[PDB]
Write an enzyme that holds these catalytic residues in place. Structure first.
Site, short mmCIF file in Angstrom:
data_model
loop_
_atom_site.label_atom_id
_atom_site.label_comp_id
_atom_site.label_asym_id
_atom_site.label_seq_id
_atom_site.Cartn_x
_atom_site.Cartn_y
_atom_site.Cartn_z
N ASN A 18 0.98 -1.21 -0.12
CA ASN A 18 0.06 -0.02 -0.02
C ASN A 18 0.88 1.20 0.15
O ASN A 18 1.88 1.27 0.71
CB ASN A 18 -0.81 -0.01 1.29
CG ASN A 18 -1.87 1.02 1.09
OD1 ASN A 18 -2.36 1.39 2.42
ND2 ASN A 18 -2.50 1.44 -0.03
N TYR B 272 -6.49 14.30 -3.28
CA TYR B 272 -6.68 13.74 -1.85
C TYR B 272 -6.26 14.69 -0.69
O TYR B 272 -5.26 15.40 -0.93
CB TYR B 272 -5.67 12.65 -1.83
CG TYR B 272 -5.65 11.64 -0.67
CD1 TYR B 272 -6.65 11.00 -0.10
CD2 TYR B 272 -4.42 12.01 0.08
CE1 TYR B 272 -6.45 10.37 1.28
CE2 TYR B 272 -4.28 11.37 1.41
CZ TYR B 272 -5.31 10.76 1.82
OH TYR B 272 -4.89 9.97 2.97
#
Length: 190
Positions: free
Chosen positions: A44, A77
């Protein structure tokens, strides 16, 4: 140039690069608002350039190429504090639509496409203030693209209309996120 996870400033832009340590990711800061990410069987990770702090009326421009092979997103984001919120304005994605199983809270038209709005909750997860329980707001573009302009106010105002409020803005970036996938991307922000 190639760096290990961290946050800082580069050529006038705030940058943030984080990874779970599984390896398989290369993040490189370029001139101006440019950044590149190359990944192969990674874990990730999240990497991008933008502003710290962001604003609620920012018009964000991005230009580049995005080639994911697996689970990955390309989005505007960021976070807000008080209330603590993690938000995404997803412009493109790979094999997984991040709104799967999420509750749809409406639609908003902005910058050439309709976006579906969703809300999800994260329980006891890592956040900018430590482990916590918080909501995530999403705007997912129906017409995928790797370049464009994002009028953030259109999203934040539509979210507000639906009861999805934001607090004080923290960082705001154009980022590439990946979850155990492969890919490459080269993006210039402005």
């Amino acid at each position: 140039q190639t760096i290990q996870p961290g946050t800082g400033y580069n050529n006038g832009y705030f940058y943030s690069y984080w990874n779970d340590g599984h390896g398989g990711v290369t993040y490189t800061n370029g001139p101006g608002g440019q950044f590149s990410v190359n990944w192969s069987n990674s874990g990730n990770f999240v990497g991008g350039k933008g502003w710290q702090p962001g604003t609620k009326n920012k018009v964000i421009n991005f230009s580049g190429s995005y080639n994911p092979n697996g689970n990955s997103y390309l989005s505007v984001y960021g976070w807000s504090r008080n209330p603590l919120i993690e938000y995404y304005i997803v412009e493109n994605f790979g094999t997984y639509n991040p709104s799967t199983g999420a509750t749809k809270l409406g639609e908003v038209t902005s910058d050439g496409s309709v976006y579906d709005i969703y809300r999800t909750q994260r329980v006891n997860q890592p956040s900018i203030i430590g482990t916590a329980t918080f909501y995530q707001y999403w705007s997912v573009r129906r017409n995928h693209r790797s370049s464009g302009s994002v009028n953030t106010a259109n999203h934040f105002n539509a979210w507000a209309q639906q009861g999805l409020t934001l607090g004080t803005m923290d960082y705001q970036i154009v980022a590439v996120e990946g979850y155990f996938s492969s890919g490459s991307a080269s993006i210039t922000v402005s």
